[PDB]
């Protein structure tokens, strides 16, 4: 029914290079600063970077010789054969926190009876998140999963849970150790997780669903490296919604310090441990020899999506400005800010391909994505989504050895 | 009267089929089930117990190939032969991110911290239980077979004969073999034992196992079974270390003998020995991508036993333990909306989700039913011949039933694990 | 001149399998418990013990072979050779802990220890620890030999430092492995009984004298060995008691009374060990080991129809907490419960043996008589009874049908 | 055929025979105190200082092969040739279990813990020294040569044409080379320096090095020596991390300049800066079997330098550092037996033991003494020719191993000899 592109896409020996040059974004690691207009965007090492790469239409490309294909019966398309995801900045680890995190007691070694909550025991705590590197390559944007609030099927009842699929947009937050969930709707107090995710949605890639799509336009390939361990053991203030059933313990004696049980609403903090050079997924070329799905790297619609998560460069810079210059130090004379910067350099190598548009081939392409034939001459549904637009229309070059990944292609292949 | 490889009487065809379960989901409470305590019956389960520390035991049901609508049935003779599926490939898919969950007890029997400083004063009192938590021993495993897997655990034994029997004597210990069901608890760092009967206070281990049985797979026994129906193969990866050093309140049942220490001087803080009922807390350390046993295909080339991947009775069992995704989600609902924060305005809940996708590749097999072969199969399992036309003892057990009757396909390259098959075998 | 057994022992193509079936022992991890007077009700069973199995093989010269035409009983004798071995281990991976309710720890000397305070009369504390992690297995036809430090000859005041002497001995089943405090006779070299935890504080901790076993001429003790040890220093303490060797004055500028420092604190430091993580990938057991070429001249020949398997495996040292109810009441009271500790070790020994023949010429009979005269005497052509071994009888357990058993299917592939 | 103006590999003038010999030391044992020697209280030693943090420098003495009782002397011509041993294999045997010892100082100059909380203020006072201990940087190494190894360490330099230096000024530093002797201390995490001269208070490092020199091998220098007699080969495995963050008491000699901070207020806790004389404690982390350099044979195929394993002067030097078996044993003796425990009734001691077994395989070589060779060897070391008939190292301390009466041709009678006959593809004579 669905076939590999190898049966209807003819490969040429024409290769082209394209590079984005330096890409930079600088912002605040925890929240955007709105003063709804954005003066400082939210820029964090815990964000998905989803690049929408724009390719020149090869059927309208200023080819110097157009005698290799026949516009009467054939059309051109680019296929991706190589990719290098460049990363600037040193390796480093950032930290996130909440000035009013709902931590009550430390339950690791010493938590004797007793001490009941009271009105507000929130504390000012921070942590380092779960370490994640990942890259996804495809010609349609990737699909993630997260837990959201279900249908009502009472005030303070546990919300029903539902697994949600969505397109991963640029700026979405990756999971951090507290799971892939919509914190804005499932944590009402805004105090159970750090402020950079407490009103955000944390998404994890739906690798299983993307792998099982028939055409395979979302996942040509992927790399991932996750790690975390549990750094501290806490519990929550607030009323325990699901009290421990009586058959799981012998109750304490009345008129005894143990006769009202403490909350078993435990929660861990995560930690990503070390970041290392030898673990890097980036700054090294990856050659697509054979995709996992039926789309063997064909960039339908003359576009390509590169999804990147890299927490190994998440260092948040401390900036300090002087309010009044005086001969002795006073805290009131200085203001403290946080800024984060991410640096990328996307390099690609593309292969020119031609498609003979017989009767059977045009039917198959129409069933796959009718917009492919309509664009070939033989509004955009993604405009509601947020992507980092990379325009490579005028960036194609045929002289590969002028550029880093092209010199590597002329050797490594 | 000799057990032989299934290769001696089962012929392989070149017919291969793919089957996939699609996404499998369960959501629940990581420590205990919630069962309509007020306003109804005890049995009525509103929220099941779902924890990354549980066994997932899938009973996969295959369509009967002798009744399957094959497009060409000229490869075998129903007059003299019967068909059976063989497992050649398997991918255990896992959704959800890697993560680590935490378990605890609001009244855990921890007395003193015995790691660095534990000076003499020493007598516990009536109730010194604390609200403590911990992260468990990390375990990954997968076992594949056509009969359910067998575990081991320690249970209360029977007392020596003509031997009493005073209350509070140390319980007799007995190693018990049993079938591992879906929802059984894996060992967590405190061993494989029946905590319900061997720990009477209900307070010596966290609440998600303190009334459970924690089982460990009896790999040795499954391997030494003559036919090898429980163990086609297995992968396992365990790790833990000791994070903290505690001791117990309560009377020390076996006092330290006097030849092992010089007693302290009376009228001195050392005149009554502290409890040497020590216990550690475990810790599973990091979870990493490179350690994963899952999300990658495994091909049965040669099973360890005599059953070389033959799925007798058109069923197969896939056993999984995966604590590398045990993150417990914190849910918080608002009781009253107010302009300032008050603890009494919010309720805290815990929920855990497990995501699976099981993919298989099966090879069609035919069996010529000669006189010796029917005799052999009858000794092995007479119910095999009865089903072929030539109640179920597993109905008391709990399995995650996966019905693949309507899920078999001959178009292998339409599916992920099938495209991968077409590269490996070179077909 | 000692020669390899390859020069006078002929190999046949006859192989046999033998398995012990499941082996279980349960006990108290720290000490044995006696009756009601002299009796072991609960043995001392600990993940820190050597397990030394004495495997008894059927005499092949008296064995009921289905075919006895491969050798000449007038001029030849039979003996077994070990070619394969799988040391099965049940029970989950885990770490147990040991301690002492009256451990001689004084101060924590890691980070903060200011000069305030004269030691006193009795400062022992109730502390525990995780031991150094050790896996090993040694295979031979004579029991293995260990090393440990013991009390020497005095050559003499009472509190003087005991003289040290390195002592060799046979490693018996139930002996304690080194734990991080060294291989020494703690019963004699630590008089207070409080400097190390109670499960070794009156025991002898032995380490295998690998150097001596390898350099013995016949090589009957060590066909091969595997070992994997690891530990780090978890805490830094010092001792109470009078410091026997005071620090010489040329190593410091003495303190003043205004600093409270004019009496030095005890520099009898001691670390606690820690074995760190136990992992699946580090395991020595539950996988076959094939003897192709032994290290010594005895290439796996089981003289006397016996084989010794020495094992240490601390990676399954979990100590179970058992809790019994004295009185059932509706509320919790500590006095209603008694707390116990139990440990269980599960083994399953599988072997594959190769039948061998020896032509008993005059030279060979001369050589074998020089090596061990009891070999010829038993062929018709026990000083180890004072030692404690886990006896494993395989006389009635040999089978020629190799593929009926786990290690026999694995043998038929490799 | 060997030029006098240039140094050449020994392969150009040393002929190898097919004669191989085994020699083993058997068990080597030393027991002592891990921190200091215990004397007789003029200067006689009752218990030596024995520590896993010491260099073991073995001087192995071989039989002169020109005077050795060979059964058949027809493989060379004593009229025109002389014999010398070449080392082809080595196994450094190590007994005792793996373990880690700890060192300390009852009066260590630690003031505050500067890792997490060190608030203002805190008055130094006259004496704040504490009783602290630590585990040292983990080090394994082995070096083989026919001359003793050369170490490096920092010492007090000479102050020339300038006597205007004040008492308590920072001493001038100078990198010093020396022969590493048996019993010298390896660096522990505080660097390779002469602590006796560069740390005057005697309290800034633990007592087992505070009046010692910690030396590190000058690998770069030994490798660049023309003849290469000190370095046939070497193996090394070092590791450490920072366990604690402390600072020193005493006056800070180099105060932090004012352009590096905004000063505090005079009537405020901050107007006298605390000492930024920081110092870490080290930690060697785990010791593991999989990391061992020893108890495995090492075969010399081709040395890095020009001396390709020739044992000139019929001697060999084996240098070993192994902190992976550094467990210090706790010994406790009873002063008075009483029915109850009293601290005063017991004495606490420390003892450390090191166990070795050195095994070698030597290859016999012959040297045809033509005119060019005699000139070449005379320029290299005239004592070689003089001993052949054709001392200065006794001021240094080495663990002397006499193997004169220990050579054997029956290679397969011995552990390393069996290992040699397999790696060489030989079958026992």
PDB file of N, CA and C in Angstrom, chain B residues 340-414:
ATOM      1  N   UNK B 340      -4.762  35.030  48.484  1.00  0.00           N
ATOM      2  CA  UNK B 340      -3.519  34.695  49.158  1.00  0.00           C
ATOM      3  C   UNK B 340      -3.483  33.188  49.379  1.00  0.00           C
ATOM      4  N   UNK B 341      -2.280  32.672  49.624  1.00  0.00           N
ATOM      5  CA  UNK B 341      -2.062  31.233  49.729  1.00  0.00           C
ATOM      6  C   UNK B 341      -2.387  30.731  51.133  1.00  0.00           C
ATOM      7  N   UNK B 342      -3.112  29.614  51.203  1.00  0.00           N
ATOM      8  CA  UNK B 342      -3.335  28.884  52.446  1.00  0.00           C
ATOM      9  C   UNK B 342      -3.279  27.392  52.153  1.00  0.00           C
ATOM     10  N   UNK B 343      -2.528  26.651  52.976  1.00  0.00           N
ATOM     11  CA  UNK B 343      -2.386  25.212  52.765  1.00  0.00           C
ATOM     12  C   UNK B 343      -3.736  24.516  52.711  1.00  0.00           C
ATOM     13  N   UNK B 344      -4.684  24.943  53.543  1.00  0.00           N
ATOM     14  CA  UNK B 344      -5.973  24.265  53.600  1.00  0.00           C
ATOM     15  C   UNK B 344      -6.770  24.387  52.305  1.00  0.00           C
ATOM     16  N   UNK B 345      -6.359  25.249  51.374  1.00  0.00           N
ATOM     17  CA  UNK B 345      -7.080  25.443  50.121  1.00  0.00           C
ATOM     18  C   UNK B 345      -6.705  24.454  49.022  1.00  0.00           C
ATOM     19  N   UNK B 346      -5.772  23.531  49.258  1.00  0.00           N
ATOM     20  CA  UNK B 346      -5.325  22.647  48.189  1.00  0.00           C
ATOM     21  C   UNK B 346      -5.207  21.214  48.689  1.00  0.00           C
ATOM     22  N   UNK B 347      -5.468  20.274  47.785  1.00  0.00           N
ATOM     23  CA  UNK B 347      -5.287  18.853  48.041  1.00  0.00           C
ATOM     24  C   UNK B 347      -4.221  18.287  47.114  1.00  0.00           C
ATOM     25  N   UNK B 348      -3.389  17.391  47.647  1.00  0.00           N
ATOM     26  CA  UNK B 348      -2.271  16.803  46.915  1.00  0.00           C
ATOM     27  C   UNK B 348      -2.543  15.338  46.596  1.00  0.00           C
ATOM     28  N   UNK B 349      -2.331  14.965  45.337  1.00  0.00           N
ATOM     29  CA  UNK B 349      -2.543  13.603  44.881  1.00  0.00           C
ATOM     30  C   UNK B 349      -1.287  13.084  44.193  1.00  0.00           C
ATOM     31  N   UNK B 350      -1.233  11.764  44.037  1.00  0.00           N
ATOM     32  CA  UNK B 350      -0.146  11.103  43.333  1.00  0.00           C
ATOM     33  C   UNK B 350      -0.730  10.193  42.263  1.00  0.00           C
ATOM     34  N   UNK B 351      -0.200  10.288  41.045  1.00  0.00           N
ATOM     35  CA  UNK B 351      -0.613   9.408  39.964  1.00  0.00           C
ATOM     36  C   UNK B 351       0.607   8.990  39.159  1.00  0.00           C
ATOM     37  N   UNK B 352       0.559   7.767  38.653  1.00  0.00           N
ATOM     38  CA  UNK B 352       1.635   7.228  37.842  1.00  0.00           C
ATOM     39  C   UNK B 352       1.057   6.640  36.566  1.00  0.00           C
ATOM     40  N   UNK B 353       1.779   6.815  35.472  1.00  0.00           N
ATOM     41  CA  UNK B 353       1.339   6.310  34.183  1.00  0.00           C
ATOM     42  C   UNK B 353       2.387   5.432  33.540  1.00  0.00           C
ATOM     43  N   UNK B 354       1.930   4.333  32.957  1.00  0.00           N
ATOM     44  CA  UNK B 354       2.804   3.415  32.246  1.00  0.00           C
ATOM     45  C   UNK B 354       2.309   3.302  30.813  1.00  0.00           C
ATOM     46  N   UNK B 355       3.236   3.409  29.858  1.00  0.00           N
ATOM     47  CA  UNK B 355       2.937   3.379  28.431  1.00  0.00           C
ATOM     48  C   UNK B 355       3.746   2.263  27.785  1.00  0.00           C
ATOM     49  N   UNK B 356       3.072   1.395  27.024  1.00  0.00           N
ATOM     50  CA  UNK B 356       3.716   0.286  26.323  1.00  0.00           C
ATOM     51  C   UNK B 356       3.299   0.242  24.859  1.00  0.00           C
ATOM     52  N   UNK B 357       4.111  -0.446  24.052  1.00  0.00           N
ATOM     53  CA  UNK B 357       3.724  -0.842  22.693  1.00  0.00           C
ATOM     54  C   UNK B 357       4.510  -2.095  22.335  1.00  0.00           C
ATOM     55  N   UNK B 358       3.835  -3.240  22.331  1.00  0.00           N
ATOM     56  CA  UNK B 358       4.479  -4.520  22.071  1.00  0.00           C
ATOM     57  C   UNK B 358       4.352  -4.890  20.596  1.00  0.00           C
ATOM     58  N   UNK B 359       5.487  -5.165  19.954  1.00  0.00           N
ATOM     59  CA  UNK B 359       5.525  -5.602  18.565  1.00  0.00           C
ATOM     60  C   UNK B 359       6.189  -6.967  18.457  1.00  0.00           C
ATOM     61  N   UNK B 360       5.624  -7.817  17.602  1.00  0.00           N
ATOM     62  CA  UNK B 360       6.086  -9.184  17.420  1.00  0.00           C
ATOM     63  C   UNK B 360       6.192  -9.523  15.942  1.00  0.00           C
ATOM     64  N   UNK B 361       7.034 -10.514  15.652  1.00  0.00           N
ATOM     65  CA  UNK B 361       7.106 -11.130  14.333  1.00  0.00           C
ATOM     66  C   UNK B 361       7.059 -12.638  14.516  1.00  0.00           C
ATOM     67  N   UNK B 362       6.069 -13.278  13.902  1.00  0.00           N
ATOM     68  CA  UNK B 362       5.839 -14.702  14.084  1.00  0.00           C
ATOM     69  C   UNK B 362       6.110 -15.462  12.796  1.00  0.00           C
ATOM     70  N   UNK B 363       6.658 -16.662  12.948  1.00  0.00           N
ATOM     71  CA  UNK B 363       6.960 -17.550  11.844  1.00  0.00           C
ATOM     72  C   UNK B 363       5.999 -18.721  11.904  1.00  0.00           C
ATOM     73  N   UNK B 364       5.326 -18.986  10.785  1.00  0.00           N
ATOM     74  CA  UNK B 364       4.370 -20.079  10.708  1.00  0.00           C
ATOM     75  C   UNK B 364       5.096 -21.411  10.633  1.00  0.00           C
ATOM     76  N   UNK B 365       4.611 -22.380  11.406  1.00  0.00           N
ATOM     77  CA  UNK B 365       5.224 -23.695  11.478  1.00  0.00           C
ATOM     78  C   UNK B 365       4.168 -24.765  11.265  1.00  0.00           C
ATOM     79  N   UNK B 366       4.615 -25.920  10.769  1.00  0.00           N
ATOM     80  CA  UNK B 366       3.754 -27.072  10.553  1.00  0.00           C
ATOM     81  C   UNK B 366       4.359 -28.279  11.257  1.00  0.00           C
ATOM     82  N   UNK B 367       3.490 -29.160  11.746  1.00  0.00           N
ATOM     83  CA  UNK B 367       3.909 -30.331  12.506  1.00  0.00           C
ATOM     84  C   UNK B 367       3.233 -31.560  11.920  1.00  0.00           C
ATOM     85  N   UNK B 368       4.037 -32.497  11.416  1.00  0.00           N
ATOM     86  CA  UNK B 368       3.518 -33.771  10.932  1.00  0.00           C
ATOM     87  C   UNK B 368       3.231 -34.682  12.119  1.00  0.00           C
ATOM     88  N   UNK B 369       1.974 -35.103  12.245  1.00  0.00           N
ATOM     89  CA  UNK B 369       1.499 -35.810  13.434  1.00  0.00           C
ATOM     90  C   UNK B 369       1.637 -37.323  13.249  1.00  0.00           C
ATOM     91  N   UNK B 370       2.886 -37.788  13.293  1.00  0.00           N
ATOM     92  CA  UNK B 370       3.150 -39.219  13.264  1.00  0.00           C
ATOM     93  C   UNK B 370       2.830 -39.869  14.609  1.00  0.00           C
ATOM     94  N   UNK B 371       3.033 -41.184  14.664  1.00  0.00           N
ATOM     95  CA  UNK B 371       2.721 -41.935  15.873  1.00  0.00           C
ATOM     96  C   UNK B 371       3.603 -41.517  17.037  1.00  0.00           C
ATOM     97  N   UNK B 372       4.914 -41.403  16.795  1.00  0.00           N
ATOM     98  CA  UNK B 372       5.832 -41.014  17.857  1.00  0.00           C
ATOM     99  C   UNK B 372       5.583 -39.580  18.317  1.00  0.00           C
ATOM    100  N   UNK B 373       5.310 -38.669  17.372  1.00  0.00           N
ATOM    101  CA  UNK B 373       5.122 -37.244  17.679  1.00  0.00           C
ATOM    102  C   UNK B 373       3.859 -37.005  18.501  1.00  0.00           C
ATOM    103  N   UNK B 374       2.738 -37.633  18.133  1.00  0.00           N
ATOM    104  CA  UNK B 374       1.536 -37.456  18.949  1.00  0.00           C
ATOM    105  C   UNK B 374       1.740 -38.012  20.348  1.00  0.00           C
ATOM    106  N   UNK B 375       2.474 -39.118  20.456  1.00  0.00           N
ATOM    107  CA  UNK B 375       2.785 -39.674  21.765  1.00  0.00           C
ATOM    108  C   UNK B 375       3.629 -38.699  22.576  1.00  0.00           C
ATOM    109  N   UNK B 376       4.631 -38.094  21.934  1.00  0.00           N
ATOM    110  CA  UNK B 376       5.504 -37.137  22.605  1.00  0.00           C
ATOM    111  C   UNK B 376       4.732 -35.896  23.034  1.00  0.00           C
ATOM    112  N   UNK B 377       3.932 -35.333  22.126  1.00  0.00           N
ATOM    113  CA  UNK B 377       3.176 -34.129  22.456  1.00  0.00           C
ATOM    114  C   UNK B 377       2.152 -34.422  23.547  1.00  0.00           C
ATOM    115  N   UNK B 378       1.602 -35.638  23.571  1.00  0.00           N
ATOM    116  CA  UNK B 378       0.630 -36.002  24.602  1.00  0.00           C
ATOM    117  C   UNK B 378       1.271 -36.024  25.985  1.00  0.00           C
ATOM    118  N   UNK B 379       2.499 -36.544  26.090  1.00  0.00           N
ATOM    119  CA  UNK B 379       3.208 -36.537  27.370  1.00  0.00           C
ATOM    120  C   UNK B 379       3.576 -35.117  27.791  1.00  0.00           C
ATOM    121  N   UNK B 380       3.904 -34.265  26.819  1.00  0.00           N
ATOM    122  CA  UNK B 380       4.293 -32.890  27.114  1.00  0.00           C
ATOM    123  C   UNK B 380       3.105 -32.096  27.643  1.00  0.00           C
ATOM    124  N   UNK B 381       2.001 -32.081  26.892  1.00  0.00           N
ATOM    125  CA  UNK B 381       0.793 -31.360  27.295  1.00  0.00           C
ATOM    126  C   UNK B 381      -0.351 -31.925  26.450  1.00  0.00           C
ATOM    127  N   UNK B 382      -1.173 -32.783  27.061  1.00  0.00           N
ATOM    128  CA  UNK B 382      -2.228 -33.447  26.299  1.00  0.00           C
ATOM    129  C   UNK B 382      -3.231 -32.449  25.738  1.00  0.00           C
ATOM    130  N   UNK B 383      -3.368 -31.288  26.376  1.00  0.00           N
ATOM    131  CA  UNK B 383      -4.318 -30.286  25.914  1.00  0.00           C
ATOM    132  C   UNK B 383      -3.951 -29.710  24.550  1.00  0.00           C
ATOM    133  N   UNK B 384      -2.696 -29.842  24.116  1.00  0.00           N
ATOM    134  CA  UNK B 384      -2.323 -29.353  22.792  1.00  0.00           C
ATOM    135  C   UNK B 384      -3.022 -30.171  21.715  1.00  0.00           C
ATOM    136  N   UNK B 385      -2.978 -31.500  21.841  1.00  0.00           N
ATOM    137  CA  UNK B 385      -3.637 -32.360  20.862  1.00  0.00           C
ATOM    138  C   UNK B 385      -5.149 -32.202  20.921  1.00  0.00           C
ATOM    139  N   UNK B 386      -5.696 -32.040  22.126  1.00  0.00           N
ATOM    140  CA  UNK B 386      -7.140 -31.910  22.270  1.00  0.00           C
ATOM    141  C   UNK B 386      -7.643 -30.663  21.554  1.00  0.00           C
ATOM    142  N   UNK B 387      -6.887 -29.565  21.637  1.00  0.00           N
ATOM    143  CA  UNK B 387      -7.282 -28.327  20.973  1.00  0.00           C
ATOM    144  C   UNK B 387      -7.191 -28.426  19.456  1.00  0.00           C
ATOM    145  N   UNK B 388      -6.296 -29.273  18.933  1.00  0.00           N
ATOM    146  CA  UNK B 388      -6.131 -29.430  17.490  1.00  0.00           C
ATOM    147  C   UNK B 388      -7.222 -30.272  16.848  1.00  0.00           C
ATOM    148  N   UNK B 389      -7.996 -31.015  17.643  1.00  0.00           N
ATOM    149  CA  UNK B 389      -9.034 -31.913  17.136  1.00  0.00           C
ATOM    150  C   UNK B 389      -8.431 -32.955  16.189  1.00  0.00           C
ATOM    151  N   UNK B 390      -7.509 -33.747  16.730  1.00  0.00           N
ATOM    152  CA  UNK B 390      -6.785 -34.721  15.922  1.00  0.00           C
ATOM    153  C   UNK B 390      -6.641 -36.057  16.653  1.00  0.00           C
ATOM    154  N   UNK B 391     -12.087 -23.961  33.016  1.00  0.00           N
ATOM    155  CA  UNK B 391     -11.418 -25.013  32.259  1.00  0.00           C
ATOM    156  C   UNK B 391      -9.908 -24.776  32.218  1.00  0.00           C
ATOM    157  N   UNK B 392      -9.527 -23.577  31.795  1.00  0.00           N
ATOM    158  CA  UNK B 392      -8.120 -23.189  31.682  1.00  0.00           C
ATOM    159  C   UNK B 392      -7.515 -23.001  33.069  1.00  0.00           C
ATOM    160  N   UNK B 393      -6.411 -23.682  33.407  1.00  0.00           N
ATOM    161  CA  UNK B 393      -5.839 -23.525  34.757  1.00  0.00           C
ATOM    162  C   UNK B 393      -5.263 -22.147  35.029  1.00  0.00           C
ATOM    163  N   UNK B 394      -5.029 -21.340  33.999  1.00  0.00           N
ATOM    164  CA  UNK B 394      -4.490 -19.999  34.165  1.00  0.00           C
ATOM    165  C   UNK B 394      -5.574 -18.954  34.410  1.00  0.00           C
ATOM    166  N   UNK B 395      -6.835 -19.371  34.539  1.00  0.00           N
ATOM    167  CA  UNK B 395      -7.940 -18.438  34.706  1.00  0.00           C
ATOM    168  C   UNK B 395      -8.063 -17.890  36.123  1.00  0.00           C
ATOM    169  N   UNK B 396      -7.323 -18.434  37.089  1.00  0.00           N
ATOM    170  CA  UNK B 396      -7.252 -17.837  38.419  1.00  0.00           C
ATOM    171  C   UNK B 396      -6.193 -16.747  38.531  1.00  0.00           C
ATOM    172  N   UNK B 397      -5.331 -16.597  37.529  1.00  0.00           N
ATOM    173  CA  UNK B 397      -4.224 -15.654  37.581  1.00  0.00           C
ATOM    174  C   UNK B 397      -4.568 -14.350  36.865  1.00  0.00           C
ATOM    175  N   UNK B 398      -3.832 -13.298  37.227  1.00  0.00           N
ATOM    176  CA  UNK B 398      -4.054 -11.947  36.721  1.00  0.00           C
ATOM    177  C   UNK B 398      -2.989 -11.619  35.677  1.00  0.00           C
ATOM    178  N   UNK B 399      -3.423 -11.352  34.452  1.00  0.00           N
ATOM    179  CA  UNK B 399      -2.522 -10.957  33.382  1.00  0.00           C
ATOM    180  C   UNK B 399      -3.108  -9.763  32.648  1.00  0.00           C
ATOM    181  N   UNK B 400      -2.225  -8.975  32.033  1.00  0.00           N
ATOM    182  CA  UNK B 400      -2.648  -7.919  31.118  1.00  0.00           C
ATOM    183  C   UNK B 400      -2.905  -8.599  29.780  1.00  0.00           C
ATOM    184  N   UNK B 401      -4.180  -8.856  29.477  1.00  0.00           N
ATOM    185  CA  UNK B 401      -4.557  -9.605  28.283  1.00  0.00           C
ATOM    186  C   UNK B 401      -4.412  -8.728  27.047  1.00  0.00           C
ATOM    187  N   UNK B 402      -3.675  -9.216  26.056  1.00  0.00           N
ATOM    188  CA  UNK B 402      -3.493  -8.507  24.798  1.00  0.00           C
ATOM    189  C   UNK B 402      -4.028  -9.406  23.692  1.00  0.00           C
ATOM    190  N   UNK B 403      -5.142  -9.001  23.087  1.00  0.00           N
ATOM    191  CA  UNK B 403      -5.814  -9.806  22.075  1.00  0.00           C
ATOM    192  C   UNK B 403      -5.264  -9.411  20.708  1.00  0.00           C
ATOM    193  N   UNK B 404      -4.566 -10.337  20.054  1.00  0.00           N
ATOM    194  CA  UNK B 404      -4.016 -10.096  18.726  1.00  0.00           C
ATOM    195  C   UNK B 404      -4.692 -10.946  17.647  1.00  0.00           C
ATOM    196  N   UNK B 405      -5.873 -11.512  17.939  1.00  0.00           N
ATOM    197  CA  UNK B 405      -6.599 -12.325  16.961  1.00  0.00           C
ATOM    198  C   UNK B 405      -6.808 -11.573  15.651  1.00  0.00           C
ATOM    199  N   UNK B 406      -7.238 -10.317  15.738  1.00  0.00           N
ATOM    200  CA  UNK B 406      -7.521  -9.498  14.569  1.00  0.00           C
ATOM    201  C   UNK B 406      -6.376  -8.557  14.225  1.00  0.00           C
ATOM    202  N   UNK B 407      -5.166  -8.857  14.689  1.00  0.00           N
ATOM    203  CA  UNK B 407      -4.046  -7.949  14.526  1.00  0.00           C
ATOM    204  C   UNK B 407      -2.894  -8.511  13.694  1.00  0.00           C
ATOM    205  N   UNK B 408      -3.020  -9.706  13.126  1.00  0.00           N
ATOM    206  CA  UNK B 408      -1.942 -10.267  12.318  1.00  0.00           C
ATOM    207  C   UNK B 408      -1.961  -9.716  10.891  1.00  0.00           C
ATOM    208  N   UNK B 409      -0.766  -9.484  10.332  1.00  0.00           N
ATOM    209  CA  UNK B 409      -0.613  -8.968   8.974  1.00  0.00           C
ATOM    210  C   UNK B 409       0.573  -9.624   8.278  1.00  0.00           C
ATOM    211  N   UNK B 410       0.429  -9.884   6.977  1.00  0.00           N
ATOM    212  CA  UNK B 410       1.506 -10.452   6.167  1.00  0.00           C
ATOM    213  C   UNK B 410       2.362  -9.396   5.479  1.00  0.00           C
ATOM    214  N   UNK B 411       1.936  -8.129   5.503  1.00  0.00           N
ATOM    215  CA  UNK B 411       2.683  -7.044   4.868  1.00  0.00           C
ATOM    216  C   UNK B 411       3.665  -6.495   5.898  1.00  0.00           C
ATOM    217  N   UNK B 412       4.827  -7.145   5.983  1.00  0.00           N
ATOM    218  CA  UNK B 412       5.766  -6.821   7.052  1.00  0.00           C
ATOM    219  C   UNK B 412       6.273  -5.387   6.949  1.00  0.00           C
ATOM    220  N   UNK B 413       6.556  -4.906   5.738  1.00  0.00           N
ATOM    221  CA  UNK B 413       7.200  -3.599   5.672  1.00  0.00           C
ATOM    222  C   UNK B 413       6.233  -2.449   5.945  1.00  0.00           C
ATOM    223  N   UNK B 414       4.963  -2.734   6.240  1.00  0.00           N
ATOM    224  CA  UNK B 414       4.037  -1.675   6.617  1.00  0.00           C
ATOM    225  C   UNK B 414       4.227  -1.215   8.055  1.00  0.00           C
TER     226      UNK B 414
END
